[PDB]
Amino acid sequence: PIVQNLQGQMVHQAISPRTLNAWVKVVEEKAFSPEVIPMFSALSEGATPQDLNTMLNTVGGHQAAMQMLKETINEEAAEWDRLHPVHAGPIAPGQMREPRGSDIAGTTSTLQEQIGWMTHNPPIPVGEIYKRWIILGLNKIVRMYSPTSILDIRQGPKEPFRDYVDRFYKTLRAEQASQEVKNWMTETLLVQNANPDCKTILKALGPGATLEEMMTACQGV
Numbered sequence: 001p002i003v004q005n006l007q008g009q010m011v012h013q014a015i016s017p018r019t020l021n022a023w024v025k026v027v028e029e030k031a032f033s034p035e036v037i038p039m040f041s042a043l044s045e046g047a048t049p050q051d052l053n054t055m056l057n058t059v060g061g062h063q064a065a066m067q068m069l070k071e072t073i074n075e076e077a078a079e080w081d082r083l084h085p086v087h088a089g090p091i092a093p094g095q096m097r098e099p100r101g102s103d104i105a106g107t108t109s110t111l112q113e114q115i116g117w118m119t120h121n122p123p124i125p126v127g128e129i130y131k132r133w134i135i136l137g138l139n140k141i142v143r144m145y146s147p148t149s150i151l152d153i154r155q156g157p158k159e160p161f162r163d164y165v166d167r168f169y170k171t172l173r174a175e176q177a178s179q180e181v182k183n184w185m186t187e188t189l190l191v192q193n194a195n196p197d198c199k200t201i202l203k204a205l206g207p208g209a210t211l212e213e214m215m216t217a218c219q220g221v
Helices: 017-029 036-043 049-058 063-083 111-118 126-144 161-174 179-192 196-202 211-218
Strands: 002-004 010-012
Touching (some): 017 036, 017 049, 036 126, 049 111, 049 126, 063 126, 111 126, 161 179, 161 211, 179 196, 196 211
Antiparallel strands (some): 002 010
16 A cells, blocks of 8 residues: 655555455455455555555456456446546646546556555545445445356256266366365365255265265165
């Protein structure tokens, strides 16, 4: 964010690696929970647009979510521009050119410009404005969740467990997800999503049941 020199200038300080590591941990752990939003807001306190983009690049592997954020950001930026039309005239020595939507998203603006806007009297709070757009995006992401690409693969009441396993793994293989997410899918979701009768059998197996043991256990259930 922004800090003052002993020589009095407002200068930029990169987000701490510990704040960044915390944010990446929140996303890893709190998948798409409403809980992500309040955390994002706490962790991004004081952030310039550059800092906010830094936080997002850190969780960019979530491509479907990043795509949703992009569309929200483009939409809000477009409305900002409608409300804040470009004015071609000269800028008075005591005025400051207003930011465009892309300046707020950090795309067409420099850190120096972001800081100049943020610390003006009164501010042009481009960090807070961009943060609101991101939050609009995050809310849309959580609200949409209720996915189908794995989560809605459920064993049928009369489905042979070997067929369910096949469907599950086929769906799994076609996804673009990190390995740690896929590991949770194979080790816990598969049982989680088995039918009532198979799940009860599966949950009564030992600590280290192999998938072949699982299929043996649930055969004709």
